[PDB]
């Protein structure tokens, strides 16, 4: 167990005051990792810090560039081309210099899943991109029961009060979600339940996809709330296996 | 108005490819005014200069409280008992270097709403939190119709889902909401007109608030309530949101 400071309880007084107490020292306890630190996991991450979590893992290969602005958290002028993953780690160091944060600059790939989760996490946000990455990382905490958000695509979509949770199986107007179903059947041997579920918690929009007016667009008002709601089922998830005991 | 230099295509390219080429100048020649820093109006700011508003009027007075951490974006260790306005002007500046920030070092009063409005703006985003300012801000920009979005309590909520717009008149579980109404009609006439709005555009909740008992638990019951960034963050969002789709449909009708 982590103990909270003095300090701790000034920053996140309101944490507490929110989700109350026990939770307090359950998200201290938390060691969470957001794989992706982009137009979702940045803000995510951001989230993470904000809501005292203790320890938590950033997992992205990627640089901050002028074109991330109008999305990220981390792209301001003084911080293109220093790599992501880090900026977002001192960042999150400034909003709680007690918080434990780990930096791996690299890529998910079917390889390194493995060694990657092995430290054993409370929970995964996965916010990655690219869909064969997003694959190898999904199949991995399925088949392992490591606790996970999956985040559909974010871009296309100006409605933020549109944005919610259902099994990936399930998610509608979503191009990248539907493509990860397609690989995680293909490569992985992931198929539906009887049920017809694949186990899998999604975060998407049922708003229909906006095309482009260099891919699709994308607004912080909506990418950041895919971000924020795939924080929220987390923690609500775990309070209540906490309680379930 | 703004002339697009190269730079601002660069940061807002993927703007332009959401919302098209019309609303980029649009959104560059706008004029938008944030009252309230805090919790809602820090991450509406943000968004803002996020998406290329050109101009960004800051209203406040407070400084960065550490106890700021859990919902506010400017909450930074290296940061507080600065201006929290000026902290985020100086943020927008990193964001798009070519924004036009103003800062007021003042809160809104009845006796000064005014000034502060008579400069003009597309719209007005109301993020404060006491009610006898809030409600001489709105019935002011109701009056005068100056674009405003308004958002009832975001504190003692958990679900960013269930954030929503309506008509003040219509909002539910938001007690914010409700003294507003009452304060609305008290001080400045303002009731429903026959359809039942009030013609003022709220962002809110549906969601039953979280209250902290003395044993350290909350109940939810339909200093004060605790709050989380994904909810407050989302207010000031779904804010901004909301107001450029009005803009747009202004500017598409001529
Ligand atoms: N395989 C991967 N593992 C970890 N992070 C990734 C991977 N593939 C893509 N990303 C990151 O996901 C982020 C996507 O953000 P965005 O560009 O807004 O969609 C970027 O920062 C990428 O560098
Ligand atoms: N009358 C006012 N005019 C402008 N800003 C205000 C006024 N009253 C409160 N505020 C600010 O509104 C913000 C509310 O933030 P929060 O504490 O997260 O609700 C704080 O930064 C306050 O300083």
Redesign the pocket.
């Known amino acids: 167990s982590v103990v909270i400071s003095d300090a701790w309880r000034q920053r996140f007084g309101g944490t507490a005051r929110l989700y109350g107490e026990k939770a307090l020292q359950l998200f201290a306890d938390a060691h969470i990792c957001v794989?992706?630190?982009?137009?979702?996991?940045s803000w995510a991450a951001e989230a993470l810090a904000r809501t005292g979590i203790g320890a938590i893992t950033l997992?992205?290969?990627?640089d901050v560039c002028v074109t991330?602005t109008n999305?990220?958290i981390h792209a301001l002028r003084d911080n293109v081309g220093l790599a992501?993953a880090e900026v977002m780690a001192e960042r999150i160091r400034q909003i709680n210099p007690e918080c434990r944060v780990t930096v791996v600059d690299d890529?998910?790939?079917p390889d390194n899943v493995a060694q990657y989760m092995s430290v054993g996490y409370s929970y995964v946000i996965d916010?990655?991109?690219?869909v064969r990455?997003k694959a190898a990382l999904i199949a991995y905490c399925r088949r392992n029961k490591i606790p996970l958000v999956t985040t559909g695509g974010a871009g296309g979509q100006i409605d933020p009060t549109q944005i919610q949770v259902t099994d990936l199986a399930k998610t509608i107007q979503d191009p990248l979600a539907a493509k990860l179903r397609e690989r995680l059947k293909s490569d992985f041997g992931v198929v539906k339940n009887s049920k017809g579920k694949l186990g899998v918690d999604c975060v998407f929009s049922t708003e229909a996809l906006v095309y482009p007016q260099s891919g699709f667009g994308?607004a912080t008002m909506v990418?950041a709330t895919f971000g924020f709601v795939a924080v929220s089922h987390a923690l609500k998830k775990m309070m209540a296996k906490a309680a379930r005991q």
């Open positions: 794989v992706g630190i982009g137009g979702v996991g997992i992205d290969m990627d991330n999305r990220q992501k890529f998910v790939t916010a990655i991109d690219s990455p994308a990418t």
